[PDB]
Symmetry: D2
Subunit: 89 residues, 4 copies
Amino acid sequence: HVHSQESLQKLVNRLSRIEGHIRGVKTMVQENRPCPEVLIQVAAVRGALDRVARLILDDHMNECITRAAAEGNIEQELAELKEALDRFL
Amino acid sequence: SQESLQKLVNRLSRIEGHIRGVKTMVQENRPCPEVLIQVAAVRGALDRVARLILDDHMNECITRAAAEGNIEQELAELKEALDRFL
Amino acid sequence: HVHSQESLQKLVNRLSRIEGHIRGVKTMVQENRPCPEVLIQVAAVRGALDRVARLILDDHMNECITRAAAEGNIEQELAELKEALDRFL
Amino acid sequence: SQESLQKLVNRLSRIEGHIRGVKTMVQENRPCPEVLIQVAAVRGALDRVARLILDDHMNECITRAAAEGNIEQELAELKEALDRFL
């Protein structure tokens, strides 16, 4: 890669897919499908969520390190990154 | 069943509503930490649902072992479920 | 497998290995080795810890389900299992 | 450095002592939940150490970017570190 900001619309998309996938898990439960099948689908949803989170974080990181090079305020930018990682982890 | 199933459906509807909430936040260009705080809550909610489903599975396995034995088989089912839950 | 209880001594062993592995991470830090190398070693220690935890849990689960078949007290045994999972997760 | 390195060494010595504590508990046949409560604390401590090491790495990368640029390269180092940290 050379890093590209994920478009707002690209993120909204990924989130719509995650919504549809949760609605799918709900259908599975109503049909009394086996517990391991349901858990497999829940795991996939959680994986999808993590990848969205990770994309949002990458773009944030990019702004922080870019703003540091541009403007030189390393302390502020570190502290911004660390907040975002706190809430991500 | 009718009792417990509906509770899970409900939780899953709430999670769905919460993901819509995260979508709205993104469209409104709200700060990253606020969006991630909401994503963390969704992830927490998903974990608790996963945990409830595992509890019911484990309940069936142990209940069936008490009733009908085949303890080795049931134990091995429990361990396989834990393999995929972690 | 047919399930076998991990011996007390087998567990003490695995824990001694984890101790030695943490002491190894400490040496790496004193020698100012690169951060990704150090984190790779920390991950391995965490993995080793998880596998120990998992073994202790498997043996507990085995006692709970065995005691349920033997004695029939499903409620007590479920609640024992769930406590152990609470502190494991 | 001499300052920060020693703090990490210390944390790692405490983690080592804590794993000995878990070993003693097992030899004394203490209940499973008590042993797992102590293992959870060790795992927590290990996570915090991992997090401190990542913070220092990230600090070097951003600091070097402000001083000397090559922002794309540094960003890619940060993302690679996060790949392995999760």
